[PDB]
Design an enzyme around this catalytic site. Sequence first.
Site, mmCIF file in Angstrom:
data_model
loop_
_atom_site.group_PDB
_atom_site.id
_atom_site.type_symbol
_atom_site.label_atom_id
_atom_site.label_comp_id
_atom_site.label_asym_id
_atom_site.label_seq_id
_atom_site.Cartn_x
_atom_site.Cartn_y
_atom_site.Cartn_z
ATOM 1 N N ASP A 114 -21.202 44.309 -9.607
ATOM 2 C CA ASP A 114 -20.315 43.186 -9.594
ATOM 3 C C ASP A 114 -19.015 43.099 -8.895
ATOM 4 O O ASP A 114 -18.296 44.142 -9.086
ATOM 5 C CB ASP A 114 -20.063 42.773 -11.049
ATOM 6 C CG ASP A 114 -20.020 41.264 -11.414
ATOM 7 O OD1 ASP A 114 -19.152 40.668 -10.416
ATOM 8 O OD2 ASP A 114 -20.352 40.644 -12.511
ATOM 9 N N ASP A 141 -15.890 44.327 -10.362
ATOM 10 C CA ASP A 141 -15.419 43.106 -10.667
ATOM 11 C C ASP A 141 -14.443 42.961 -11.842
ATOM 12 O O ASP A 141 -13.201 42.384 -11.378
ATOM 13 C CB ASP A 141 -16.500 42.337 -11.129
ATOM 14 C CG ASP A 141 -16.018 40.689 -11.187
ATOM 15 O OD1 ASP A 141 -15.946 39.949 -10.451
ATOM 16 O OD2 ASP A 141 -15.762 40.601 -12.652
ATOM 17 N N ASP A 155 -22.925 40.902 -5.731
ATOM 18 C CA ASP A 155 -23.284 39.531 -6.101
ATOM 19 C C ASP A 155 -22.173 38.545 -5.332
ATOM 20 O O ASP A 155 -22.534 37.586 -4.940
ATOM 21 C CB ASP A 155 -23.205 39.229 -7.607
ATOM 22 C CG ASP A 155 -21.888 39.565 -8.279
ATOM 23 O OD1 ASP A 155 -21.012 40.274 -7.563
ATOM 24 O OD2 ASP A 155 -21.912 39.306 -9.305
ATOM 25 N N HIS A 156 -21.027 39.096 -5.004
ATOM 26 C CA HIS A 156 -20.012 38.243 -4.387
ATOM 27 C C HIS A 156 -18.788 39.261 -4.272
ATOM 28 O O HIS A 156 -18.825 40.432 -5.072
ATOM 29 C CB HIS A 156 -19.504 37.154 -5.367
ATOM 30 C CG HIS A 156 -18.958 37.371 -6.297
ATOM 31 N ND1 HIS A 156 -17.873 38.013 -6.834
ATOM 32 C CD2 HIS A 156 -19.595 37.096 -7.760
ATOM 33 C CE1 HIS A 156 -17.883 38.494 -8.071
ATOM 34 N NE2 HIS A 156 -19.138 37.867 -8.588
ATOM 35 N N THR A 184 -20.859 34.986 -10.324
ATOM 36 C CA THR A 184 -21.997 36.142 -10.991
ATOM 37 C C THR A 184 -23.200 35.545 -11.315
ATOM 38 O O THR A 184 -24.353 35.934 -10.651
ATOM 39 C CB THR A 184 -21.063 36.669 -12.135
ATOM 40 O OG1 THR A 184 -20.096 37.379 -11.876
ATOM 41 C CG2 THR A 184 -22.157 37.848 -12.585
HETATM 42 C C1 XLL Z 1 -30.278 36.856 -13.733
HETATM 43 C C2 XLL Z 1 -29.586 38.371 -14.251
HETATM 44 C C3 XLL Z 1 -28.077 38.038 -14.705
HETATM 45 C C4 XLL Z 1 -30.288 38.776 -15.412
HETATM 46 C C5 XLL Z 1 -29.597 39.502 -13.317
HETATM 47 C C6 XLL Z 1 -30.132 39.261 -12.170
HETATM 48 C C7 XLL Z 1 -30.487 40.662 -11.141
HETATM 49 CL CL1 XLL Z 1 -31.302 40.388 -9.923
HETATM 50 C C8 XLL Z 1 -29.891 41.496 -11.505
HETATM 51 C C9 XLL Z 1 -29.972 42.591 -10.740
HETATM 52 N N1 XLL Z 1 -29.942 43.817 -10.110
HETATM 53 C C10 XLL Z 1 -29.185 41.755 -12.548
HETATM 54 C C11 XLL Z 1 -29.192 40.609 -13.469
HETATM 55 O O1 XLL Z 1 -28.128 40.630 -14.565
HETATM 56 C C12 XLL Z 1 -27.500 41.915 -14.948
HETATM 57 C C13 XLL Z 1 -26.593 41.825 -15.854
HETATM 58 N N2 XLL Z 1 -26.939 42.758 -16.995
HETATM 59 N N3 XLL Z 1 -25.833 42.543 -17.852
HETATM 60 C C14 XLL Z 1 -24.852 41.450 -17.483
HETATM 61 N N4 XLL Z 1 -23.770 40.978 -18.106
HETATM 62 C C15 XLL Z 1 -23.166 39.971 -17.375
HETATM 63 C C16 XLL Z 1 -23.672 39.566 -16.163
HETATM 64 C C17 XLL Z 1 -24.566 40.142 -15.707
HETATM 65 C C18 XLL Z 1 -25.445 40.978 -16.167
HETATM 66 CA CA CA Z 2 -19.800 38.633 -10.484
HETATM 67 ZN ZN ZN Z 3 -15.461 38.144 -11.630
#
Ligand code: XLL
Ligand code: CA
Ligand code: ZN
Length: 807
Positions: A121, A261, A308-309, A159
């Site tokens: 992140d 992040d 992601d960014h 995110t």
């Molecule tokens: C769509 C989704 C968010 C499930 C996702 C997609 C992908 Cl492709 C990946 C990868 N690599 C990770 C993902 O989630 C990781 C995650 N876990 N916990 C969190 N808490 C807060 C924000 C993000 C997360």
């Molecule tokens: Ca993010």
């Molecule tokens: Zn952020």
Amino acid sequence: WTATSGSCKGRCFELQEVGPPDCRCDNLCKSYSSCCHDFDELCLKTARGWECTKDRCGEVRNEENACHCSEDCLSRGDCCTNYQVVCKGESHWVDDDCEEIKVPECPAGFVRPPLIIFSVDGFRASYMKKGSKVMPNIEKLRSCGTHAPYMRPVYPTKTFPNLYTLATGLYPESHGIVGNSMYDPVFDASFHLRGREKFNHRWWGGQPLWITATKQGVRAGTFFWSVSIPHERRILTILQWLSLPDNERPSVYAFYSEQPDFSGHKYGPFGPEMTNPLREIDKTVGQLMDGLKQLRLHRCVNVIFVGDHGMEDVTCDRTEFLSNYLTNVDDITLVPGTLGRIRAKSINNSKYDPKTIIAALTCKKPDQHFKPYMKQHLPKRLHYANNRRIEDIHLLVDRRWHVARKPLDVYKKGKCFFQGDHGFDNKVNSMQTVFVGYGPTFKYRTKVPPFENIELYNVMCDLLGLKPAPNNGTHGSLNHLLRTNTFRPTMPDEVSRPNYPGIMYLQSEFDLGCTCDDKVENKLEELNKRLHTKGSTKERHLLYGRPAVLYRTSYDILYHTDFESGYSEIFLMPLWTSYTISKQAEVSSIPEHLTNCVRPDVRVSPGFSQNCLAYKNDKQMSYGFLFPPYLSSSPEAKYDAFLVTNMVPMYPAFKRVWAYFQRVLVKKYASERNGVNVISGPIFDYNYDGLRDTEDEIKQYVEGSSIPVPTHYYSIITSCLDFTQPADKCDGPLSVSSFILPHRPDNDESCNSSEDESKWVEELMKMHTARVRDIEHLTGLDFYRKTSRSYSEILTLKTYLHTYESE
Ligand SMILES: CC(C)(C)c1cc(Cl)c(C#N)cc1OCc1n[nH]c2ncccc12
Ligand SMILES: [Ca+2]
Ligand SMILES: [Zn+2]
Ligand SMILES: *[C@@H]1O[C@H](CO)[C@@H](O[C@@H]2O[C@H](CO)[C@@H](O[C@@H]3O[C@H](CO[C@H]4O[C@H](CO)[C@@H](O)[C@H](O[C@H]5O[C@H](CO)[C@@H](O)[C@H](O)[C@@H]5O[C@H]5O[C@H](CO)[C@@H](O)[C@H](O)[C@@H]5O)[C@@H]4O)[C@@H](O)[C@H](O[C@H]4O[C@H](CO)[C@@H](O)[C@H](O)[C@@H]4O[C@H]4O[C@H](CO)[C@@H](O)[C@H](O)[C@@H]4O)[C@@H]3O)[C@H](O)[C@H]2NC(C)=O)[C@H](O)[C@H]1NC(C)=O
Ligand SMILES: [Ca+2]
Ligand SMILES: [Cl-]
Ligand code: NA
Ligand code: NA
């Protein structure tokens, strides 16, 4: 309700989700408040930490330990990741020289190389270089594998929109996760970072990779990790799953880090405090790779390191307040921060007017750090409009700034906390993120050009032998990342063949209300103009074949000395116009006597022609030309530019933009690029879906006529990547830049538009930079059909976006 008095004994991080009220032992159980009573004790062991030490080597197995250093740990799949290093004299993966992985080297019973996605992140692209001294594991992945200098996220650069784009190959407008916060008016429901509504499946459109995998018989690990599961335990859980029996073992896995992040918001992107989170992420990568090496999977697994960014410097003092612009500030709801979305506070208020809000926010202060847009006027490259969850009014916020409703929102949420944020326009350098691919299926020591994160779903599907669900990637455009598993696409078939009309009408058959001072008269030059109307210069002006029309319609190819066009009998104007301007070309003026000249085209029926009377009687609408009269090759050739079949409707405000592009910029680009080929045309996207409108979707016509008004005008400008060769004699790769300019009756978007076009037009055109692919979606045309280049390379070219950011 959950009956939390079942047990996780032997079920820790079970892959299948059991349904309420039965107690769960999978990741998500924590996020749902549904874990069995003994989940922490059994599944989240921490005793003795995460590393072996010499005194633990060959210990007696103690099942309380977080991980094991006993002789049986390899066969149990639960050693600490450094076990073989501490106890068996082995090297850490990072200390081993890079050796090319020419073929997968997998244990028996592995049907395909597994894929592990390691997502980070807020991992800004420049961290790869600026942090390289503290990230040795990441640097080995990057230098030994395949990497891009950066990867472009989607807008908004938040995110959930970006992680779900990674998972689906879709733009946020299509997948539905259009921000970290959302209101859906059909559901009358809100989606937030906090809380429980975000788990309802109705938010999440498309088909994410884990579902694509499962539907096609490929098992998947979890993608979402609960925040309280520490990273060391996420890695251990992946490694444990990798030791499962063949019939039970997943083929695709994901890890996620909340860092960098988390710290970047507090300290800014390059705060001194950022070194430690980068060290820690690298350590976690090291644990994974050491763990893979223990399992003899380090030359079997494909690993993707992806962000992601990015992250930008943003502080509370760089906040614009809507209360400094609007009187009515309590009648709106703002979604705030690094983007603005505005809707009415109450749908009972019929005195809410979008037009007056936009006007109160347009160019009101000389250094204003946001710009308001109706969503359909946002740059088309953002693909941010076709969803009921995206509010009609949008604010694009300048990098480094925030927007908020009132000052009280910023200090009651009175001193500043944060120094970093993200969410801005996805072409901004600080928002760019990272991509690295390492493994048997990726290339060795290979740098690839920057690309968009929408493309990765297709590649992940290729890496796993899956057929991707329909998505917004261009499958094949990333084949150059891969050693093998390439997807071999074919060009789409042309649906409509053109007509090739000859001279079929006499001048007196037309009653278009047009005039031209052209009654001005030789067998040398008479045969020569005839050859030009049969296509003798077409090789010069149509360099890459004619575009193919991918829908059913009626159109004519029209040849001329200086340009070629595909003329639509249905829309009464060209779909495309193609011409080449050499480095040496001269710009001339429109002679005095030809200022209002429009000429009937004797190849095209009156009934399928525009007419000048319509423009005379439409007080709002004027007209322009697709092939510019200024670039005529000779006085006699200039008459072709005034044909009624080269005319298109243009608001006078837009003609300022268009005239400057044609009179000044084309020639400038030709001088700089050593010639250019230009393809220009109209676009109709009245329902803002990014897709070509059918005739029955057109909302505006030139008054009193069947002449449809374009929403946008495009140009595709191609030259030789090796600029020592002229555009029209190029032997190797091509170079492109394109734009999709909105066709607007005012220049309110450009706050400096009272000035000379040299101070604002090019800036507008940069904002509306586009990919060739974006123009393809919007026109139903297929470009670059006849080149010497491989189709995959052309696909890469079609996805290129010229960003106009420096390094
Ligand atoms: C769509 C989704 C968010 C499930 C996702 C997609 C992908 Cl492709 C990946 C990868 N690599 C990770 C993902 O989630 C990781 C995650 N876990 N916990 C969190 N808490 C807060 C924000 C993000 C997360
Ligand atoms: Ca993010
Ligand atoms: Zn952020
Ligand atoms: C990026 O890639 C994506 C994916 O390829 C592209 O999106 C596709 O575009 C197609 C054309 O716009 C579209 O096809 C339509 O599908 C309708 C069936 O849709 C459902 O089923 C699919 C398949 O599983 C599903 O994915 C859809 O999911 C959407 O909706 C749910 C919520 O309801 C969301 O969870 C999800 O996020 C997604 O939302 C997005 O798409 C919808 C449009 O479907 C938007 O409204 C949202 O804002 C959001 O962007 C669906 O659940 C099908 O019924 C349509 O058929 C109509 O049109 C045909 C034309 O041939 C016509 O012949 C028929 O008559 C029919 O019309 C009838 O309905 C009309 C409207 O109600 C009515 O006016 C008429 O009079 C008729 O009664 C149509 O074929 C496809 O669904 C989406 N897919 C996705 C995933 O978005 C996208 O175009 C690409 N972008 C670019 C720029 O290239
Ligand atoms: Ca459309
Ligand atoms: Cl719990
Ligand atoms: Na007019
Ligand atoms: Na203006």
